[PDB]
Design a protein around this nucleic acid. Structure first.
Lengths: 124, 57, 185, 141
RNA sequence: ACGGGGAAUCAGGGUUCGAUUCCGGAGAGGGAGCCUGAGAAACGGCUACCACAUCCAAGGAAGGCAGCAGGCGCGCAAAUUACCCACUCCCGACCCGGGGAGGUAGUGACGAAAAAUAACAAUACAGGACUCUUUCGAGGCCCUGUAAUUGGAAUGAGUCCACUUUAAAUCCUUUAACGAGGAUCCAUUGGAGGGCAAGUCUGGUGCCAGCAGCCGCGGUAAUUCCAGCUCCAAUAGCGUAUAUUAAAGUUGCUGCAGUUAAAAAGCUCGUAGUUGGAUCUUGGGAGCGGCCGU
C-alpha cells in the first residue's frame, strides 16, 4: 500500500530534468528504501529508473508519511553531467579515491620541499 | 576545654544505626498527585485547629 | 563565526517568596485539579499569561483607533479566541485582563483528552499522550503541553496505529497470548 | 534634589558622582585598596597549602574551639586562617596538603563565633570535604 | 578600558555588564625599517636590534600557534594532535583544482526548550452524599482516598535487524524482534527554633564535639549538634563561594536626609555656576449638526 504523491513539480530545461518534492505514504511499515521509491516513481512518470535521483527523506513524527526531494533527468548523459558526485556514487556509477585529505596534504607539503622532476618521487 | 585532640568526638561515639527498609517514594507527578490527595480531597473540617503534617505532640 | 542560532529564552519565572503558604497550596490545587508534574509546569502557564497580560496593559495605554493598537490588539484577540481561551462573543481586549490560569490549563491536550472522556482520569490522560495513543488530525502527539486550537478540538481521538484504536495489539497482551498457548500446549 | 533648575544637569550629576564615594559598598568596589588587600585577589575560590592546623577560641558567649587551617596561598604567597566545616573533618587534613578554599559567606567579613576567619576549606588534595564527611570518596594516599 | 550594535536586571526612573560569533579599530614575543604589489609599514614576507630558543662535524644554519588540533605553564577557571570540501562562501588561468574559512562528529549538567520515573480495576478499610436509627448498626445503587493484597492491559529507558539520515557515518524520525511488579529498569539535593515551607518524636553528646548567612542552639527533660524514623521544599536537578541587579526612597532626577539619631560653613561680602516680577491681539466674516459644538 506504499503510495507516492509528488508536489512542487518543476521542469528545469537548463539542467534538463524534472524536480519535485516527494510525499510518500507508508503507514504500518518503516521508511521504504530509496530504490523502491525510485522504481515506484519510474512507473508513475513513464521513464527508466536510472535517470531518477530521489534523496533527503525526513519521516514526520508518528510515521504514516515521509517527505524527500526528487529529480528525473532526460538522459543518463545529462544525469552524469549535471548531478553532484556523491549522489551518483549512491547508484554505484562513480568511485572516488580512498586517500584521506591528511595523506594528500602531507604529500603536498613534502612535494614543496623538492623542486622539478623530484616532486614525482615523494610517494615512492 | 578540648584542644586539637577532641576533633570528631561526638561523630565517633554515636550508636551507629543502619537505615530501615522503605518502599521507595514515587517521583514526578505521581508524587504531586499523592501530596494533593494528602491535603485537598481527603481531610475534614476539624474542631479548634488543623495540625501539621509531621505533628507528634 | 558559525551558522548556529543561539536565540533561546526562559518559559517561566520562579516566584519571589519561595514559601507563601497561600501560593504553595493554590499551585498544588492547580497541579492536582489538572494533573501537571511540577510547579515549573504552572509557572510556565502563569508566565505566558503574564506576557499576554503585559502586552494588553501596553495596548490599553494607546489611544482608541491607533493603527498599531487596532492591528496588534485584534492580532492578540484572534489568537486567544483561536485556542479556545476567550470567546468570539467577548473578543474585546479589556476582557484579556479578566482571564486566568485555569482558562489555559483547560486548553492543554492532557485536559481535553480527559474531558472528551476517551481517558479515565487526568493522570491516565498524560499516560495516553506520553505513550503515543492519541492523535490530532492524523498527527500522533507525544506531548501533553499541546494547546488545542478551537477548530482542532473535535479531531482529538485515538491513533489508528494504537491498540485502543484499530491498531496492532500491544506487547503485554501478545506475550500473554503466546504464554497462554505455551500454557495450554 | 536641592537644585531643580532646567539647566542644572552637571551640578546634579557631578554632586551625585562626588557623594557616591561616601557610600561603603561603592568606595570598596571602585578602589584598588579593597581588591588588592583581598587575599584571594578578587577570585571566588583559591588553592593553598596547609602549613599548620589551628584551634581558634570561639567568641565571648558560646565557647567551643573552632578547628581552622593556616594556609599559604599559591597565587599570592599570602597567609590565611581558613575554617574546616562539619564534625571531625580536621582528621581528613594531613599537613602540606593542597586545599581549595572559598569565602565563609559575608563577602570577606568574619562569621559567627570565629574571630578574623573569613574562609572555609572546600576540597582537600582535590577531593571534596563533603564527599569525605559523607564517606562517598575515600582519601587517596 | 578595544568602541559600538548589544547583554542582565527592571513599576516609572535607573543600575551593572559588553574579551565573546555583526560592524569598525588594533596587533602578531617587544620596538624599528622596508621589498613586491592596485592595495601591506604584511609577519603561515624579508631586514636589523632586544628578549627567548632550535640544529651543529662548533665553520655555520634555522625560528615566531593572540590560525586548527595538541603540549607546558599559569591558575578557582575552559573540549579531539577526529572526518569532510557535500552545504555556506572564498581564491585561481578555473563548469574540473584548493580552502583547520566553513561544515560534520567527539568531549560538554555554561546555559535554553520539551519531558519518563507509572496508569487502570477487584478487594479488604476509611471519609462524604441518602431511606433509616436517640446511639449502634443495615444497604451500597453514588463517590473519594490508602495496603510489597491480587489481576491483566500499557509504553519506552535499554538491547537491536533494516530503511531513512549523511561526503561517509552518527543522533533524531520510521520500523521487525526482544525489553517491567520490590515495575531493584531502585531521584536526588538541601532542610525541618524564628525569618522560612516542614516534629516540641526517639537514641547519643554535655558550653565538648559541632551547628549557626543574622538572632541564636550546645553545661543531663537539645524543637537547632551527631544519627534513626518522619515531614517539607525545589526536582533531573539541588547546594556553596564570589562579582553584579532588584529588594536600596540605604545615593534619592522621578525621590532621601541635615533642632536632638550622621549632618547647616563662625559670620558676611563676592566673580563664573544656577534661578530670575508684571506687561506687547482680539473680535467676528463663511458653512454644517442638534444656546453649545467641528
Amino acid at each position: 500500500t506504499v503510495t507516492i504523491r509528488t508536489r512542487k513539480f518543476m521542469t528545469n530545461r537548463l539542467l534538463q530534468r524534472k524536480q519535485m518534492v516527494i510525499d510518500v505514504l507508508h503507514p504500518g511499515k518503516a521508511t521504504v528504501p530509496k530504490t523502491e521509491i525510485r522504481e515506484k516513481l519510474a512507473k508513475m512518470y513513464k521513464t527508466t529508473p536510472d535517470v531518477i535521483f530521489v534523496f533527503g527523506f525526513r519521516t514526520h513524527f508518528g510515521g504514516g508519511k515521509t517527505t524527500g526531494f526528487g529529480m528525473i533527468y532526460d538522459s543518463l548523459d545529462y544525469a552524469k553531467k549535471n548531478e553532484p558526485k556523491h549522489r551518483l556514487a549512491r547508484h554505484g556509477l562513480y568511485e572516488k579515491k580512498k586517500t584521506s585529505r591528511k595523506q594528500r596534504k602531507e604529500r603536498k607539503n613534502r612535494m614543496k620541499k623538492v623542486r622539478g622532476t623530484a616532486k614525482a618521487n615523494v610517494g615512492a | 576545654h578540648g584542644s586539637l585532640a577532641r576533633v570528631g568526638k561526638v561523630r565517633g561515639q554515636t550508636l551507629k544505626v543502619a537505615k530501615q527498609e522503605k518502599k521507595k517514594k514515587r517521583t514526578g507527578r505521581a508524587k504531586r498527585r499523592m501530596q494533593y490527595n494528602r491535603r485537598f480531597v481527603n481531610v475534614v473540617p476539624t474542631f479548634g485547629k488543623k495540625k501539621g503534617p509531621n505533628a507528634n505532640s | 563565526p558559525v551558522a548556529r542560532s543561539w536565540v533561546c529564552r526562559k518559559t517561566y519565572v520562579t516566584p519571589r517568596r519561595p514559601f507563601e503558604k497561600s501560593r504553595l497550596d493554590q499551585e498544588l490545587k492547580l497541579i492536582g485539579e489538572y494533573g501537571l508534574r511540577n510547579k515549573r509546569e504552572v509557572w510556565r502557564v502563569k508566565f505566558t499569561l503574564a506576557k499576554i497580560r503585559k502586552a494588553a496593559r501596553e495596548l490599553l495605554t494607546l489611544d482608541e483607533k491607533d493603527p498599531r493598537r487596532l492591528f496588534e490588539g485584534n492580532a492578540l484577540l484572534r489568537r486567544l479566541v483561536r485556542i479556545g481561551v476567550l470567546d468570539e462573543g467577548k473578543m474585546k481586549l479589556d476582557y484579556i485582563l479578566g482571564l486566568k490560569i485555569e482558562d489555559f490549563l483547560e486548553r492543554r491536550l492532557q485536559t481535553q483528552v480527559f474531558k472528551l472522556g476517551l481517558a479515565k482520569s487526568i493522570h491516565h490522560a498524560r499516560v495516553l499522550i506520553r505513550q503515543r495513543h492519541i492523535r490530532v488530525r492524523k498527527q500522533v502527539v507525544n506531548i501533553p503541553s499541546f494547546i488545542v486550537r478551537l477548530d482542532s478540538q473535535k479531531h482529538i481521538d485515538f491513533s489508528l496505529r494504537s491498540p485502543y484504536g484499530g491498531g496492532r495489539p500491544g506487547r503485554v497482551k501478545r506475550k500473554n497470548a503466546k504464554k497462554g498457548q505455551g500454557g495450554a500446549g | 534634589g536641592k537644585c531643580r533648575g532646567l539647566r542644572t544637569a552637571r551640578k546634579l550629576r557631578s554632586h551625585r558622582r562626588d557623594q557616591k564615594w561616601h557610600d561603603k559598598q561603592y568606595k570598596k568596589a571602585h578602589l584598588g585598596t579593597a581588591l588588592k588587600a583581598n587575599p584571594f585577589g578578587g577570585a571566588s575560590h583559591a588553592k593553598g597549602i596547609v602549613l599548620e592546623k589551628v584551634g581558634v577560641e570561639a567568641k565571648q558567649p558560646n565557647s567551643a574551639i573552632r578547628k581552622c587551617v593556616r594556609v599559604q596561598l599559591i597565587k599570592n604567597g599570602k597567609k590565611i586562617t581558613a575554617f574546616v566545616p562539619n564534625d571531625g573533618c580536621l582528621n581528613f587534613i594531613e599537613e602540606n596538603d593542597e586545599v581549595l578554599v572559598a569565602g565563609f559567606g559575608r563577602k570577606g567579613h568574619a562569621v559567627g563565633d570565629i574571630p578574623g576567619v573569613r574562609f572555609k576549606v572546600v576540597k582537600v588534595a582535590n577531593v571534596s570535604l563533603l564527599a569525605l564527611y559523607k564517606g562517598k570518596k575515600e582519601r587517596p594516599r
